[PDB]
Design a protein around this nucleic acid. Sequence first.
RNA 1: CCAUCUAUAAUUUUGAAUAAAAAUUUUGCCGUUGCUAUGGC
Lengths: 139, 391, 24, 35
Amino acid sequence: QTSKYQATSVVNGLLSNLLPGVPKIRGSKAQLIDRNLKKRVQLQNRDVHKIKKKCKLVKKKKVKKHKLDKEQLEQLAKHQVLKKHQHEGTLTDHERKYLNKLIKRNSQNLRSWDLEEEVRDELEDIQQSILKDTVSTAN
Amino acid sequence: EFLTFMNNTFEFINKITEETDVRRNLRLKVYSVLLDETSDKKLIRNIREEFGTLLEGVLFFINSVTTEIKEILFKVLGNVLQILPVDEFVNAVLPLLSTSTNEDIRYHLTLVIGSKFELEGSEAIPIVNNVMKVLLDRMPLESKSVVISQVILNTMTALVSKYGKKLEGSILTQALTLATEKVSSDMTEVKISSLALITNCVQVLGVKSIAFYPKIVPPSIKLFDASLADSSNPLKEQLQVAILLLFAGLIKRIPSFLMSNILDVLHVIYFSREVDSSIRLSVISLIIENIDLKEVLKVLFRIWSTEIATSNDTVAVSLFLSTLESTVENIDKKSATSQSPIFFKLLLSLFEFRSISSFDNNTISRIEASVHEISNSYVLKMNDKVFRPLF
Amino acid sequence: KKQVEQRLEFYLAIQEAMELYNKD
Amino acid sequence: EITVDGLDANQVWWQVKLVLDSIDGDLIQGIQELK
RNA sequence: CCAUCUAUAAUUUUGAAUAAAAAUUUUGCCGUUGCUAUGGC
């Protein structure tokens, strides 16, 4: 029966690749002739191409999802390796650049909140005026 | 008692191995070792060797199992399969196939290998090349076991279908040579797997498979004749579909080379009783838009006089009519005129079908109606000069 | 209330290969 | 290679036709250079 | 639509018989109640 199931599965796969619209494997004679002739035109009018498109799009989503899972998972393991190497001082040349980039990234971010050099000029000038009156220091 | 405890025993390995934090996940720890360059290589081979025993151990329980305990084992196996990547999976599993002495276990290991490639991409092309060299070498060894023999061929079929073109050519040709030899295998399973592999291999190779053409089609036609004789075969329907699908694939890939042997192809389609009419009628169309029509019309006369006329089979006659009507509605102006004498010669025989036909009046009348419309279609679409002698 | 009540109500592949082999 | 074993004249010609037609393109181009 | 031809069904011959073969021509759902009739939605 695995003989049977394996037999069906292989031929079913071939059918989809070659004849997508055809169903898978699982009276008066004149009427039979007429039916087959009718089956010809409707099969000829079948829209196979969109069927081939649908199976592709279904498969592509699964492959894409798994690829993202692999992409996400290795980064976590990659970042773990950076932790242990850094704590033990086993940093390679590559790892010493990735963190150095992070220094630039974070330091670059903090620059926006550090404000401009032009503003601190008058802020400092205004800053001193208000101290000297509240702090006094003439006496 | 023991079973209840044994049922509990497999809840643990499920619970521990279940992928419910970098530290907790057994899966994630494995990659960190692999990604860590400083990790000893002798440490890595321990992971590969240790996993193989674990995978073999769980399969042994599955092979030798109880429904609920059976269910848990797959939960355990699924966790086990995802512990390590495809790169290490193949290296830690392919050696075990020869090492494994149990036919059931070997039957299991083949399935899991295919499942890993079901969702892989072009990154596994070097991996897949390694696997084929192993699977090809195991085929002569595993020829005794049909189930193992069938599965290995099936796995090769799925993966030659998937990015088979990118695989190194030497493996492809070797696979084709392997498949053709196994076509003659007495067991029906090996044939259908053999035919299936030939379809994809011929599909990828295309014209490069012409060297094997004498080893593909003439055996298949002989196989079909044997297929009719052994009507007690439980896989007769599957076997016949395999023969038809074999032709359908190569009708798309190598039309020109098949025109000479096109006659026997139609003989297969018309007299393949078990296969569904939709399957047959589909492959009738492919012949029309892939093979030169002029050759077909020449053959339609010979096959009609030889077999279909005396066949007395409703399906065969209807299929023949579907071919003839499809050809005439597609045949060109120039080709129709040149082939006119043969068509009219066939037309006279069709008119005389009533004399020999064993069917009732209604069928013959309906058949004659189809003959007249195609004749009207065929006599139209020509000029006066060609028709005047024929008239 | 009973009228309101009625209104309230109104509104793996390899696994298969594994099992099928064992049955044989 | 043009396979002739177990193949009729028509099939052999198709192998000949595909090969020669492909070889026609570069041969003509080579002739143009040599002229 | 009418006729005709088929299809379905019934009697009959070889036939233990199957078999072929001439031949002819009460509900959409759910129950109860009989071996038929009526209760709910």
